[PDB]
């Protein structure tokens, strides 16, 4: 069962910015999870034909990945912070929506999860 076209990366008549934030988002918040040990499995969508996994993009609506995340912040697509962040908690909850507890790939989101919320935690106040 078919792989649909990934989320949107480019588009010129959105509005956006780059903030003190957002660059906060790229420099500390996804290079931390990019670079850590569990970040491979999230690193691009979701092959669910090489996967064979057939139903998750019929379970998975609204997906999302820190490939497409890395794209959206060096393309400075997004207008605000929270957009981003909304888009890593879309991320960690698709892969808790999709399979079981204590699945490899759970563990794998929740170690990533935890440093987001710890990044996040720290996120600057907008300039
Ligand atoms: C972001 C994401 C969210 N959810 C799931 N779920 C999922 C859930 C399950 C199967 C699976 O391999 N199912 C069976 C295996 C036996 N077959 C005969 C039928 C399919 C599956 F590959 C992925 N993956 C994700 N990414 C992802 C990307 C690459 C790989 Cl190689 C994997 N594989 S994984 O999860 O087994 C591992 C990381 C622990 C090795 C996962």
Redesign the pocket.
């Given at each position: 069962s078919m792989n649909p076209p990934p989320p949107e990366t480019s588009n010129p008549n959105k509005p956006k910015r780059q903030t003190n934030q957002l660059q906060y988002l790229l420099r500390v918040v996804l290079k931390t999870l990019w670079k850590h040990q569990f970040a491979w499995?999230?690193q691009q969508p979701?092959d669910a034909v090489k996967?064979?996994?057939p139903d998750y993009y019929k379970i998975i609506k609204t997906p999302m990945?820190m490939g497409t995340i890395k794209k959206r912040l060096e393309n400075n697509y997004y207008w605000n912070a929270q957009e981003c962040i909304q888009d890593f908690n879309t991320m960690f909850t698709?892969?808790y929506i999709?399979?079981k507890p204590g699945?490899?790939?759970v563990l794998?989101a929740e170690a990533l999860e935890k440093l987001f919320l710890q990044k996040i935690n720290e996120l600057p106040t907008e300039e």
């Open positions: 499995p999230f979701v996967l064979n996994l990945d698709n892969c999709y399979n699945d490899d790939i794998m």
